[PDB]
Amino acid sequence: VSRLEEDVRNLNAIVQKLQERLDRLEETVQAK
Amino acid sequence: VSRLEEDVRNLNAIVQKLQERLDRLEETVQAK
Amino acid sequence: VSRLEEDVRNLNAIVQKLQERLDRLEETVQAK
Ligand SMILES: [Zn+2]
Ligand SMILES: [Zn+2]
Ligand SMILES: [Zn+2]
Ligand SMILES: [Zn+2]
């Protein structure tokens, strides 16, 4: 696994966490 | 294209959408 | 640094900015 492949896998995981965080905040602002 | 090429262009598309959603939510919060 | 490596560098920078924006917006929402 090259450094480039390692970095991409890490980015996939980071972007998944950001998406969940964003989704939660959008719903926190909706305040249903 | 290779898996790495695919993963990188996919990440580019996702982060663009995240940026747009964040832009929108920032504006929404400010306007509330 | 190849093009693919540069795209990954730029994704790293973008995700850092997005994480910061999310942090600030979460704080804004909790404060307001
Ligand atoms: Zn969720
Ligand atoms: Zn949701
Ligand atoms: Zn939900
Ligand atoms: Zn694709």
mmCIF file with all atom_site columns, N, CA and C in Angstrom, chain B residues 2-31:
data_model
loop_
_atom_site.group_PDB
_atom_site.id
_atom_site.type_symbol
_atom_site.label_atom_id
_atom_site.label_alt_id
_atom_site.label_comp_id
_atom_site.label_asym_id
_atom_site.label_entity_id
_atom_site.label_seq_id
_atom_site.pdbx_PDB_ins_code
_atom_site.Cartn_x
_atom_site.Cartn_y
_atom_site.Cartn_z
_atom_site.occupancy
_atom_site.B_iso_or_equiv
_atom_site.pdbx_formal_charge
_atom_site.auth_seq_id
_atom_site.auth_comp_id
_atom_site.auth_asym_id
_atom_site.auth_atom_id
_atom_site.pdbx_PDB_model_num
ATOM 1  N N  . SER B 1 2  ? -7.925  3.761  -13.120 1.00 0.00 ? 2  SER B N  1
ATOM 2  C CA . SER B 1 2  ? -7.528  2.983  -11.973 1.00 0.00 ? 2  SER B CA 1
ATOM 3  C C  . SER B 1 2  ? -8.362  3.277  -10.744 1.00 0.00 ? 2  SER B C  1
ATOM 4  N N  . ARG B 1 3  ? -8.333  2.373  -9.781  1.00 0.00 ? 3  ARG B N  1
ATOM 5  C CA . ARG B 1 3  ? -9.034  2.594  -8.526  1.00 0.00 ? 3  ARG B CA 1
ATOM 6  C C  . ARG B 1 3  ? -8.617  3.880  -7.840  1.00 0.00 ? 3  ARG B C  1
ATOM 7  N N  . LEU B 1 4  ? -7.326  4.177  -7.835  1.00 0.00 ? 4  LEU B N  1
ATOM 8  C CA . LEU B 1 4  ? -6.884  5.406  -7.224  1.00 0.00 ? 4  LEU B CA 1
ATOM 9  C C  . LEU B 1 4  ? -7.405  6.637  -7.928  1.00 0.00 ? 4  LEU B C  1
ATOM 10 N N  . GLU B 1 5  ? -7.373  6.635  -9.251  1.00 0.00 ? 5  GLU B N  1
ATOM 11 C CA . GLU B 1 5  ? -7.896  7.749  -10.031 1.00 0.00 ? 5  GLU B CA 1
ATOM 12 C C  . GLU B 1 5  ? -9.384  7.941  -9.751  1.00 0.00 ? 5  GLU B C  1
ATOM 13 N N  . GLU B 1 6  ? -10.110 6.827  -9.716  1.00 0.00 ? 6  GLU B N  1
ATOM 14 C CA . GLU B 1 6  ? -11.530 6.890  -9.384  1.00 0.00 ? 6  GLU B CA 1
ATOM 15 C C  . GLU B 1 6  ? -11.800 7.439  -7.992  1.00 0.00 ? 6  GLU B C  1
ATOM 16 N N  . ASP B 1 7  ? -11.058 6.936  -7.012  1.00 0.00 ? 7  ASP B N  1
ATOM 17 C CA . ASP B 1 7  ? -11.268 7.369  -5.632  1.00 0.00 ? 7  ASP B CA 1
ATOM 18 C C  . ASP B 1 7  ? -10.991 8.861  -5.498  1.00 0.00 ? 7  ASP B C  1
ATOM 19 N N  . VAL B 1 8  ? -9.934  9.340  -6.128  1.00 0.00 ? 8  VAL B N  1
ATOM 20 C CA . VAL B 1 8  ? -9.608  10.760 -6.037  1.00 0.00 ? 8  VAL B CA 1
ATOM 21 C C  . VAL B 1 8  ? -10.668 11.628 -6.727  1.00 0.00 ? 8  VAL B C  1
ATOM 22 N N  . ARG B 1 9  ? -11.143 11.265 -7.932  1.00 0.00 ? 9  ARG B N  1
ATOM 23 C CA . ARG B 1 9  ? -12.155 12.125 -8.579  1.00 0.00 ? 9  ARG B CA 1
ATOM 24 C C  . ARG B 1 9  ? -13.490 12.063 -7.835  1.00 0.00 ? 9  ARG B C  1
ATOM 25 N N  . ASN B 1 10 ? -13.799 10.922 -7.229  1.00 0.00 ? 10 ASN B N  1
ATOM 26 C CA . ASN B 1 10 ? -14.983 10.794 -6.390  1.00 0.00 ? 10 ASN B CA 1
ATOM 27 C C  . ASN B 1 10 ? -14.883 11.709 -5.170  1.00 0.00 ? 10 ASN B C  1
ATOM 28 N N  . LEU B 1 11 ? -13.749 11.687 -4.478  1.00 0.00 ? 11 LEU B N  1
ATOM 29 C CA . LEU B 1 11 ? -13.511 12.583 -3.343  1.00 0.00 ? 11 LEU B CA 1
ATOM 30 C C  . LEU B 1 11 ? -13.633 14.040 -3.733  1.00 0.00 ? 11 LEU B C  1
ATOM 31 N N  . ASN B 1 12 ? -13.111 14.387 -4.881  1.00 0.00 ? 12 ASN B N  1
ATOM 32 C CA . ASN B 1 12 ? -13.271 15.760 -5.381  1.00 0.00 ? 12 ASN B CA 1
ATOM 33 C C  . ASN B 1 12 ? -14.761 16.149 -5.520  1.00 0.00 ? 12 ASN B C  1
ATOM 34 N N  . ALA B 1 13 ? -15.565 15.252 -6.067  1.00 0.00 ? 13 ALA B N  1
ATOM 35 C CA . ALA B 1 13 ? -16.975 15.539 -6.236  1.00 0.00 ? 13 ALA B CA 1
ATOM 36 C C  . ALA B 1 13 ? -17.700 15.637 -4.898  1.00 0.00 ? 13 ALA B C  1
ATOM 37 N N  . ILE B 1 14 ? -17.375 14.763 -3.955  1.00 0.00 ? 14 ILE B N  1
ATOM 38 C CA . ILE B 1 14 ? -17.973 14.794 -2.652  1.00 0.00 ? 14 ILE B CA 1
ATOM 39 C C  . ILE B 1 14 ? -17.604 16.085 -1.906  1.00 0.00 ? 14 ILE B C  1
ATOM 40 N N  . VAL B 1 15 ? -16.337 16.450 -1.891  1.00 0.00 ? 15 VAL B N  1
ATOM 41 C CA . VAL B 1 15 ? -15.932 17.640 -1.137  1.00 0.00 ? 15 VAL B CA 1
ATOM 42 C C  . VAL B 1 15 ? -16.537 18.909 -1.727  1.00 0.00 ? 15 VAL B C  1
ATOM 43 N N  . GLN B 1 16 ? -16.735 18.955 -3.029  1.00 0.00 ? 16 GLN B N  1
ATOM 44 C CA . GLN B 1 16 ? -17.457 20.075 -3.652  1.00 0.00 ? 16 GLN B CA 1
ATOM 45 C C  . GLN B 1 16 ? -18.879 20.167 -3.133  1.00 0.00 ? 16 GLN B C  1
ATOM 46 N N  . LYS B 1 17 ? -19.572 19.042 -3.043  1.00 0.00 ? 17 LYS B N  1
ATOM 47 C CA . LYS B 1 17 ? -20.932 19.034 -2.506  1.00 0.00 ? 17 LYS B CA 1
ATOM 48 C C  . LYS B 1 17 ? -20.964 19.419 -1.018  1.00 0.00 ? 17 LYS B C  1
ATOM 49 N N  . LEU B 1 18 ? -19.993 18.953 -0.238  1.00 0.00 ? 18 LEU B N  1
ATOM 50 C CA . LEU B 1 18 ? -19.887 19.352 1.163   1.00 0.00 ? 18 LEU B CA 1
ATOM 51 C C  . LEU B 1 18 ? -19.664 20.845 1.329   1.00 0.00 ? 18 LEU B C  1
ATOM 52 N N  . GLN B 1 19 ? -18.799 21.408 0.506   1.00 0.00 ? 19 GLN B N  1
ATOM 53 C CA . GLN B 1 19 ? -18.566 22.846 0.529   1.00 0.00 ? 19 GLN B CA 1
ATOM 54 C C  . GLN B 1 19 ? -19.844 23.631 0.250   1.00 0.00 ? 19 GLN B C  1
ATOM 55 N N  . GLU B 1 20 ? -20.599 23.188 -0.747  1.00 0.00 ? 20 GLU B N  1
ATOM 56 C CA . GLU B 1 20 ? -21.861 23.835 -1.104  1.00 0.00 ? 20 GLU B CA 1
ATOM 57 C C  . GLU B 1 20 ? -22.865 23.734 0.031   1.00 0.00 ? 20 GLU B C  1
ATOM 58 N N  . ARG B 1 21 ? -22.980 22.556 0.650   1.00 0.00 ? 21 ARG B N  1
ATOM 59 C CA . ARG B 1 21 ? -23.912 22.380 1.779   1.00 0.00 ? 21 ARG B CA 1
ATOM 60 C C  . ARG B 1 21 ? -23.497 23.260 2.953   1.00 0.00 ? 21 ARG B C  1
ATOM 61 N N  . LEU B 1 22 ? -22.208 23.374 3.208   1.00 0.00 ? 22 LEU B N  1
ATOM 62 C CA . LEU B 1 22 ? -21.719 24.231 4.280   1.00 0.00 ? 22 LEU B CA 1
ATOM 63 C C  . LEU B 1 22 ? -21.982 25.693 4.002   1.00 0.00 ? 22 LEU B C  1
ATOM 64 N N  . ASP B 1 23 ? -21.722 26.131 2.784   1.00 0.00 ? 23 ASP B N  1
ATOM 65 C CA . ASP B 1 23 ? -22.064 27.501 2.379   1.00 0.00 ? 23 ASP B CA 1
ATOM 66 C C  . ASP B 1 23 ? -23.529 27.806 2.681   1.00 0.00 ? 23 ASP B C  1
ATOM 67 N N  . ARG B 1 24 ? -24.402 26.891 2.308   1.00 0.00 ? 24 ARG B N  1
ATOM 68 C CA . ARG B 1 24 ? -25.821 27.082 2.499   1.00 0.00 ? 24 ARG B CA 1
ATOM 69 C C  . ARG B 1 24 ? -26.191 27.130 3.976   1.00 0.00 ? 24 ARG B C  1
ATOM 70 N N  . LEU B 1 25 ? -25.644 26.216 4.766   1.00 0.00 ? 25 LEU B N  1
ATOM 71 C CA . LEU B 1 25 ? -26.008 26.146 6.158   1.00 0.00 ? 25 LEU B CA 1
ATOM 72 C C  . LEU B 1 25 ? -25.475 27.389 6.903   1.00 0.00 ? 25 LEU B C  1
ATOM 73 N N  . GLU B 1 26 ? -24.277 27.871 6.569   1.00 0.00 ? 26 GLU B N  1
ATOM 74 C CA . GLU B 1 26 ? -23.739 29.085 7.179   1.00 0.00 ? 26 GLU B CA 1
ATOM 75 C C  . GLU B 1 26 ? -24.703 30.243 6.926   1.00 0.00 ? 26 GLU B C  1
ATOM 76 N N  . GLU B 1 27 ? -25.182 30.367 5.711   1.00 0.00 ? 27 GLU B N  1
ATOM 77 C CA . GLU B 1 27 ? -26.092 31.453 5.364   1.00 0.00 ? 27 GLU B CA 1
ATOM 78 C C  . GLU B 1 27 ? -27.407 31.314 6.111   1.00 0.00 ? 27 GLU B C  1
ATOM 79 N N  . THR B 1 28 ? -27.900 30.091 6.209   1.00 0.00 ? 28 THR B N  1
ATOM 80 C CA . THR B 1 28 ? -29.159 29.812 6.898   1.00 0.00 ? 28 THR B CA 1
ATOM 81 C C  . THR B 1 28 ? -29.103 30.195 8.373   1.00 0.00 ? 28 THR B C  1
ATOM 82 N N  . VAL B 1 29 ? -28.016 29.811 9.029   1.00 0.00 ? 29 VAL B N  1
ATOM 83 C CA . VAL B 1 29 ? -27.814 30.132 10.429  1.00 0.00 ? 29 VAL B CA 1
ATOM 84 C C  . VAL B 1 29 ? -27.741 31.652 10.613  1.00 0.00 ? 29 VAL B C  1
ATOM 85 N N  . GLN B 1 30 ? -27.004 32.340 9.761   1.00 0.00 ? 30 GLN B N  1
ATOM 86 C CA . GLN B 1 30 ? -26.851 33.788 9.900   1.00 0.00 ? 30 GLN B CA 1
ATOM 87 C C  . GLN B 1 30 ? -28.195 34.500 9.741   1.00 0.00 ? 30 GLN B C  1
ATOM 88 N N  . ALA B 1 31 ? -29.053 33.971 8.870   1.00 0.00 ? 31 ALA B N  1
ATOM 89 C CA . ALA B 1 31 ? -30.359 34.559 8.561   1.00 0.00 ? 31 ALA B CA 1
ATOM 90 C C  . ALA B 1 31 ? -31.467 34.208 9.519   1.00 0.00 ? 31 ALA B C  1
#
